[PDB]
Amino acid sequence: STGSATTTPIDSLDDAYITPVQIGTPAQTLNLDFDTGSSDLWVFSSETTASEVDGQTIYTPSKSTTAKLLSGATWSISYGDGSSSSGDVYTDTVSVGGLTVTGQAVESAKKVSSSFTEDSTIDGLLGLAFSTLNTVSPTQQKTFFDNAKASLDSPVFTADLGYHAPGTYNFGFIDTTAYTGSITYTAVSTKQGFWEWTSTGYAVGSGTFKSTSIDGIADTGTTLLYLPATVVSAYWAQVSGAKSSSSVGGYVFPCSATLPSFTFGVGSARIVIPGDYIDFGPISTGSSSCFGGIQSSAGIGINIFGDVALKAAFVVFNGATTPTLGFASK
């Protein structure tokens, strides 16, 4: 089997991407944030504290003839940006782009933190990291990908995120028309439960490539590109007026600037992030100070190849017995 679904930016800055997901019988369609940095599929629901729902579409398990309460199971998750959610668990039928999993754990939110409530466009998350990170207790549950894997034509999914435009998540096949040149594959460590890999270096604009190992995670659920302070300082030094602002919470730059590109290495291959992809617009409405899309990972504890990086590539998440990651230009 295979599946193919379009993923759409939630706003004009590509702050996140939503993908429609069918849950239950008859189908209830919710727009979920596909997150290769976590491993829970959770949804706003009829059980979510009413004051914490503001415009989201909810899953109502009592209206699904295939929903079953997973007795005794609870979940609770905290994300890198400080947001969180928790609740109980059902199993139900879940379909993505024509690919159907029966008996998928659907984690129903009883509580969500303010940032989730305040974002009306995201109805929940669909985790695509390794199932070892799943938070369901006392019986850990599998991700959608893990459940689908054996049925897929090939044990892979691909992320093709757009810049200010829709893109595609595919399951079970590689669309050879969706990228240019070749796909370069690179090793993955699953030791921390992430799609963790090592970039071979970087360049700023038309500058010379610096060969240096940068360990980090491919994370569709993180907006920006978080890299070591040395790398980030080298980038922003090429932008007149750019500075790190503790009050704003990162590097800012004059909105009148033309940003240089940023290149990252995948083996001997190179992915170029155009300068415009690094512009996240005014820090507040009407400001002439703009927020940068490349930020320091210092004090996160890990480097993160988030959407800023991933949307410059066609990315293969290869879930073979020994997982790997592939990157192509597009």
How many beta carbons lie within 10 A of that of residue 75, not counting itself?
Answer: 24
Whole-angstrom Cα distance, residue 311 to residue 77? 26
Q: Give the position of tokens 């409405």.
A: 285
Q: Which residues contact 32 (CB under 8 A, 6 or more apart)?
A: 18, 19, 20, 21, 41, 43, 122, 123, 124, 125, 126
Residue located via tokens 């939630």:
10
Q: Do 193 and 316 belong together in one domain?
A: yes
Q: Are residues 168 and 185 located together in one domain of the fold? A: no
Under 8 Å between Cβ of 242 and 294: no
**The pair of three-digit structure tokens given for residue 137, joined into one six-digit string:** 């207790």
CA 104 to chain centre: 20
Residues in contact with 322: Cβ distance below 8 Å, sequence separation at least 6, in sequence order: none
CA–CA distance, 30 with 22 (Å, rounded to integer)? 7
Residue in this structure with the two tokens 């799943």, named with its chain if needed: 134
Does one domain contain both 215 and 277? yes
Exposure pattern of 33-51 as b/e (b: 16+ CB <10 Å)? bbbbbbbbbbbbbebbeee
CATH code assigned at 243: 2.40.70.10
Q: What whole-number distance in Å separates Cα of residue 84 and Cα of residue 115?
A: 9
Tell me the two tokens of residue 272. Answer: 């170029």
Give the neighbor-by-neighbor strand order of the sheet with 250-254.
Answer: 243-245, 250-254, 289-292, 279-282
Which residue reads 């940095």 in tokens? Answer: 37
Neighbours of 8 (CB within 10 A): 17
The verdict on 119 and 186 lying in the same domain is: no
- What are the structure tokens assigned to 217, written together? 């995670």
CA distances from 269 to 25, 182, 232 (A): 45, 9, 21
Last residue of a domain, one of 121, 156, 174: 174
Same domain, 158 and 16: yes
Which residue in the list 35, 92, 119, 307 is annotated as catalytic? 35
For 26, phi then psi, to 5°, come to -60, 160
Same domain, 181 and 328: yes
- Are 230 and 271 part of one and the same domain? yes
Domain identity same for 161 and 148:
yes
Q: State the resolution, in angstroms.
A: 1.4
Experimental method: X-ray
Which phi and psi angles does 196 have, rounded to 5°? -100, 130
- Helix H, strand E, coil C: the string for 109-147 is EEEECHHHHCCCCCCEEEECCCHHHCCCECCCCCCHHHH
Is position 206 annotated as part of the catalytic site? no
CA distances from 210 to 200, 231, 327 (A): 8, 10, 19
241 and 269 fall within a common domain: yes
Do the bridges between strand 314-318 and strand 324-328 make them parallel or antiparallel, or are there none, so unpaired?
A: antiparallel
How many domains is the chain built from?
2
Q: Of 129, 156, 174, which one is at a domain's C-terminal end?
A: 174
**Burial class (CB within 10 angstroms; exposed 0-12, middle 13-18, buried 19+) of 238:** middle
Range of the domain at 44: 5-174
- β-pairing, 84-96 with 324-328? unpaired
Q: Beta-carbon neighbour count of residue 91 at 10 Å?
A: 19
- SS3 per residue for the chain: CCEEEEEEECCCCCCCEEEEEEECCCCEEEEEEEECCCCCEEECECCCCHHHCCCCCCECHHHCCCCEEEEEEEEEEECCCCCEEEEEEEEEEEEECCEEEEEEEEEEEEEECHHHHCCCCCCEEEECCCHHHCCCECCCCCCHHHHHHHHCCCCEEEEECCCCCCEEEEECCCCCCCCCCCCEEEECECCCCCCEEEEEEEEECCCCCEEEEEEEEECCCCCCEEECHHHHHHHHCCCCCCEEECCCCEEEEECCCCCCCEEEEECCEEEEECHHHHEEEECCCCCCEEEECEEECCCCCCEEECHHHHCCCEEEEECCCCCEEEEECC
Same domain, residue pair 117 and 147: yes
Q: Which of 45, 199, 261, 297 is catalytic?
A: 199
Q: Are residues 201 and 59 in the same domain?
A: no
CB-side exposure of 34: number of CA atoms within 13 Å? 29
Instruction: Report the alpha-carbon distance of residue 318 to residue 130 in Å, rounded.
Output: 12
Selection from 97, 118, 124 nearest residue 4 by Cα? 97
Residues 85 and 160 in one domain: yes
Asked about 219 being catalytic, the answer comes back as no
Cα–Cα distance for residue pair 290/17, rounded to 1 Å: 21
CA–CA distance from 242 to each of 250, 301, 304 (Å)? 10, 24, 22
CA distances from 135 to 39, 79, 277 (A): 8, 12, 33
Compute the distance between CA of residue 288 and CA of residue 51 in angstroms, rounded to an integer. Answer: 35
Domain end among 174, 195, 223: 174
